[PDB]
Design a protein around this ligand. Sequence first.
Ligand SMILES: O=C1c2c(O)ccc(O)c2C(=O)c2c(NCCNCCO)ccc(NCCNCCO)c21
Ligand SMILES: CC(C)CCC[C@@H](C)[C@H]1CC[C@H]2[C@@H]3CC=C4C[C@@H](O)CC[C@]4(C)[C@H]3CC[C@]12C
Ligand SMILES: CC(C)CCC[C@@H](C)[C@H]1CC[C@H]2[C@@H]3CC=C4C[C@@H](O)CC[C@]4(C)[C@H]3CC[C@]12C
Lengths: 566, 566
Amino acid sequence: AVLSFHNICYRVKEILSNINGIMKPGLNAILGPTGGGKSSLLDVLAARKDPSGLSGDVLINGAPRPANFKCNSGYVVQDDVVMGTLTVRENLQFSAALRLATTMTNHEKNERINRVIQELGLDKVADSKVGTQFIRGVSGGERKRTSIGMELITDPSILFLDEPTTGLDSSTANAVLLLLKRMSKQGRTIIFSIHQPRYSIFKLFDSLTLLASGRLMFHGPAQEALGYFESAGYHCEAYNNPADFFLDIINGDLIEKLAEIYVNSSFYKETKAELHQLSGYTTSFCHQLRWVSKRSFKNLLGNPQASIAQIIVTVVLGLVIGAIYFGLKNDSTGIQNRAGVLFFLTTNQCFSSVSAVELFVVEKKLFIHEYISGYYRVSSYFLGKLLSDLLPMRMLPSIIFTCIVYFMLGLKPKADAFFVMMFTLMMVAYSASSMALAIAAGQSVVSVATLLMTICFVFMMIFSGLLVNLTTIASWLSWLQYFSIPRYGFTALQHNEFLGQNFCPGLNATGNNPCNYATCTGEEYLVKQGIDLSPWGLWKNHVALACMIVIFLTIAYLKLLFLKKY
Amino acid sequence: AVLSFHNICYRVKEILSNINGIMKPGLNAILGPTGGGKSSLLDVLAARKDPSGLSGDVLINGAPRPANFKCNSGYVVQDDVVMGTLTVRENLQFSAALRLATTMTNHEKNERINRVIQELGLDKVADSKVGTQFIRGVSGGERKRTSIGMELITDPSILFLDEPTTGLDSSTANAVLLLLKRMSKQGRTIIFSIHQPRYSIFKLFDSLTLLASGRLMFHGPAQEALGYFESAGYHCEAYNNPADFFLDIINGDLIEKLAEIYVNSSFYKETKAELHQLSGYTTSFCHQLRWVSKRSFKNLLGNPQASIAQIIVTVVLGLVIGAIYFGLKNDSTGIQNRAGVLFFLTTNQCFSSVSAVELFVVEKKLFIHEYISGYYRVSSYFLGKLLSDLLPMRMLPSIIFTCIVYFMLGLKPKADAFFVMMFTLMMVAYSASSMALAIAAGQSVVSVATLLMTICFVFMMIFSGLLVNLTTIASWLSWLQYFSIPRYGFTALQHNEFLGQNFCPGLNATGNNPCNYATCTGEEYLVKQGIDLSPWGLWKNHVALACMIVIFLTIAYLKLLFLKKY
Ligand SMILES: O=C1c2c(O)ccc(O)c2C(=O)c2c(NCCNCCO)ccc(NCCNCCO)c21
Ligand SMILES: CC(C)CCC[C@@H](C)[C@H]1CC[C@H]2[C@@H]3CC=C4C[C@@H](O)CC[C@]4(C)[C@H]3CC[C@]12C
Ligand SMILES: CC(C)CCC[C@@H](C)[C@H]1CC[C@H]2[C@@H]3CC=C4C[C@@H](O)CC[C@]4(C)[C@H]3CC[C@]12C
């Protein structure tokens, strides 16, 4: 399969104006400065831009590009987006299970995971972890190689590479770039956009397309690239690199004058002659959930640097709160002391789950790459990570928390009340995290994603029945009490706590008491807060919290589905 | 003045082992890969490394290097550390006032601010703001030029440049690098370490010193640099750049073998022959405070993007708190409602001043550069920014705040009580900011500087007399209540608030009342919290808060003074 393209007009201002060229099933290249359409022409051929501003036609071996061209052709993006906290054997296994297991069996597809493991040369680092900025692993020259084989699993006719030697320590650059020539003998069309090649790959170019400032300068093979400028008016004599010279006419030793002789050159008049002649998901849903979770669950425990940091800070906080209110009694300072701690637990769960914004913003460029390549639907990436990084990461600081703080305090020695506290602590922890998930998904920078959290969760802990006595704010702004997660947690934690206690030893304030403004018995404390004493008045909050989850979850699912991924 | 150095042995592993060379009062260069001692040799000649691991002698024109060599010789660091939110006319004025005004007058030194303004060519952008990532200004080619003239004010014999063309859009690279040759005609010795020169400056090198992997490869002028390798065993024929070839022997088309012929070459045997022959603050304190503040105060209002963002979020928070507790009455919900708001004000000041960690961590590399160059003492940089970015930035969210929230609430309609609230709100705001200043000064990354804040200020708002009733925690951990800023704010805000109110209409609970556990009169509310009713018991907190400032300020002054600035 060969690629070709004609009269490509791309507008955002036209960033890619008058570009036409033909590829070969060999090893091609897109050179030039990065300010022009160098990166832009590669995404056009990869169908990675949006097709709105495009005008021309990318004709693949005479056929027009179908909609499943993107699932047939890999695209190694610039930065290493491989899963760093996994092993390269499993890292090739992740893509292999998401694009092949429809009709072939398991051990059938096990062949091509090993068949590609020595053509890359990855057998010496096959069973090692990759390597991140938080951990050490395989060297950086083979972080790029496992990116290449990851899209080599599905059988490619075309293979793009966005700048595959940016930050790769050029002593290691030749072996991967010789390896792309070795793949090209079988028929794999390779169209990369290398960044400042010195000389070593420049002898091994089957074609090249230099592009600068949105104007097509030169397209032709590298052996006849030297013989262009020496009869075109631009002398590159000895002690001058040829791959470095070609951009010096743009540097000024005119912005369109460097390319207008290419219209009247001996390349474009016959390249058009071919172009004027040539112009005449896949895997099941339960399997897609089973693999994005298994990748994410292995990524969770594989880097337990911040996951278990949340565990040990939940243990010692529940020990400190346990040491402070150790054996809190039913004296005068019962309502002041046990409504205080229940305020702290719900607002901490509201505030410790600001870290959930760092969920869809680390792997955002990974998700944009893996959705558009066809690994999974958005409904699989979204649901798969909630079962992996949201359920067994917010459930833990509610049952590790409440087993320590409850009996060390002596709140209410029942068996359901220990459970309707553990349930409502994980109900605010799922609700507040999914709220922080909502207004931070589909974003790249967590500057405003944390700025919009920390000034909004203080617009909620005000309206939470401790600092305010909610039934005393006048009604024209007291409607805001319903739009606040910690009110439902605090009230549900108060309703199962102040129901049998009387904070008043030496008397009884059940039915007969003079000298009011007392609040001796516990239910009178709740009616001053306006919390309903009915048993529905506990579970009124949870069905308001469960609706708070699902409302705030589907806006997060929308923001990933309605995200511009081009 | 000419520089020279002999047998330079630098250990951290020896990063700079056997390097010796001579400079010329011309234009020198330090080439090679960045992994070796390329950047390391420049800091040695600039006396920018620490002199601990150094063994050899940097001999300047036969004299040894004095301790005031660093104030005599500029050093343009790699990144642009000029003040971006100032005008280049004032940007040259800042250095001019800090190193010249001891004996000459003001308008005398005004000559050399203009005398250097056209040799750089900065007259067209003299009265414009420089340019940052938050604002636009002068182009990036002249951001580097104002860095050069900023150390040209004091009369230099020697002038270093750490990589002066890293990210400078090489079409603009020649004019600044031709300008360094134009400065070299007067006698200014220029020793830079340029990064990958292509050819254009390579013809204009008065000397060069290539260095790779801590082993001295070649030192000699560029005209006799070509004639080295063609009789040394390494052929660089036509269509090969000479400045790019010299590192290909390290790339492998042996780590010490490339330099051992330089020991038996026709350069080192006579360079040693000179070396074996040659081996035979300033400005007043009130003026230094007056200029670092004027720079910082102009940097504050010159970029009012986040400064006035704190103002408008203080106004609308004080309006929202004003709208919530609008006219709070003396009913049963008086203690629940007005001790709640006073908890919120002190903890917000404790928590809104987490942004004070972004004070000595933005200009840290600026401070390291400007202290070591001799602009000011550490006591001037530290005190100058407190009078600029700490006084009129935390005073504003305590008098803009308390004028709105006080009379809209109706707290206590005195005239001192409005002031002993405004005083104690700015006492926590200065204390908590200076605590956040303390454990974040002298650091580069605000990851742990915010991580150690947000988990410590919740170890303080627990012990603040609202969630806990401090006199009920057993004494073996209740000693922790003194190590907490918001307890002193909340208590001082409570002591001036609960002193005449009785929250109990229809009765009086002054001296005669049955049916206790009432808390009807306001002073009985304070004695349950253990807050002393004596008038010293208000100001007990402020003299504990003023000692909290000075203790937490001098650890910040220590961390800048005892900071490794090499
Ligand atoms: O925990 C709180 C918090 C709280 O427990 C009770 C009241 C609070 O106001 C907070 C809180 O504010 C908080 C964080 N916010 C800092 C910015 N607040 C500025 C308000 O204008 C930022 C982070 C944060 N918690 C991180 C705790 N780490 C896990 C241990 O539970 C908090
Ligand atoms: C997208 C965002 C802004 C929507 C906010 C979600 C909140 C405000 C919505 C979603 C579900 C709603 C709740 C669902 C049903 C109940 C139970 C009823 O007995 C009291 C009201 C209450 C509790 C509703 C209040 C408003 C509510 C909590
Ligand atoms: C470096 C850090 C850890 C030191 C912490 C500072 C705090 C804990 C120190 C510094 C100054 C000290 C205060 C100064 C004097 C008083 C007034 C006295 O009537 C009560 C104790 C009290 C209030 C001290 C308590 C402890 C104190 C507040």
